[PDB]
Amino acid sequence: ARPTVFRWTGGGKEVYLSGSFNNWSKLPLTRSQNNFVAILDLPEGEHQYKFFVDGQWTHDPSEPIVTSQLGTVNNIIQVK
Ligand SMILES: OC[C@H]1O[C@@H]2O[C@H]3[C@H](O)[C@@H](O)[C@@H](O[C@H]4[C@H](O)[C@@H](O)[C@@H](O[C@H]5[C@H](O)[C@@H](O)[C@@H](O[C@H]6[C@H](O)[C@@H](O)[C@@H](O[C@H]7[C@H](O)[C@@H](O)[C@@H](O[C@H]8[C@H](O)[C@@H](O)[C@@H](O[C@H]1[C@H](O)[C@H]2O)O[C@@H]8CO)O[C@@H]7CO)O[C@@H]6CO)O[C@@H]5CO)O[C@@H]4CO)O[C@@H]3CO
């Protein structure tokens, strides 16, 4: 059982993490270096997420994405 590192390297000033794991609320990320990071204990399974970056909903382009039932694009983590 192992925590998941969320690391936004896309730049910006104020970044929050949102996802199924927090009912799409906003977790403010702490800036380390030029990046923004959180560590979450996510259980086994699938978890959709997105970033809110300087007032804009945004996904990480390097990471897996899926289209939601809302027609919106989320990143996705799968924990074994
Ligand atoms: O809030 C939870 C939600 O968070 C994240 O979503 C954000 C998203 O990432 C941002 O991009 C932005 O969304 C904007 C979007 O980009 C714009 O295109 C626009 O959206 C309009 C739609 O394009 C338009 O089609 C219409 O939408 C209607 C749907 O088509 C219709 O199906 C229905 O939608 C309902 C869903 O079918 C149902 O499943 C349920 O939706 C839930 C999602 O399935 C679930 O994943 C989660 O959603 C996340 C999302 O995945 C994240 O990316 O919870 C959802 C809510 O419970 O309920 C839907 C109805 O609530 O009805 C809609 C509305 O008629 O209109 C929309 C509005 O114009 O506008 C967006 C800006 O608001 O922001 C969202 C956060 O709001």
Side-chain angles (χ1 to χ4, degrees), residues 18 23-24 48 50 57 68-74:
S18 186
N23 302 301
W24 297 96
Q48 284 176 55
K50 202 163 187 167
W57 289 97
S68 79
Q69 300 172 92
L70 183 59
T72 63
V73 170
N74 292 330

Side-chain angles (χ1 to χ4, degrees), residues 5-12 14-79:
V5 172
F6 290 86
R7 182 168 188 271
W8 173 259
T9 61
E14 302 294 340
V15 181
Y16 309 78
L17 177 62
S18 186
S20 62
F21 46 76
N22 67 10
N23 302 301
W24 297 96
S25 60
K26 289 182 184 87
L27 172 70
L29 300 184
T30 307
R31 196 149 133 100
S32 77
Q33 320 282 324
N34 292 317
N35 304 313
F36 297 80
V37 177
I39 301 173
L40 300 181
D41 298 318
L42 296 173
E44 176 168 29
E46 290 148 317
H47 311 275
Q48 284 176 55
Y49 72 100
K50 202 163 187 167
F51 296 94
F52 191 82
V53 180
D54 301 329
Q56 292 291 126
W57 289 97
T58 318
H59 70 274
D60 187 342
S62 70
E63 303 305 293
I65 51 174
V66 69
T67 305
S68 79
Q69 300 172 92
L70 183 59
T72 63
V73 170
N74 292 330
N75 293 120
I76 187 170
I77 291 316
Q78 178 168 59
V79 177

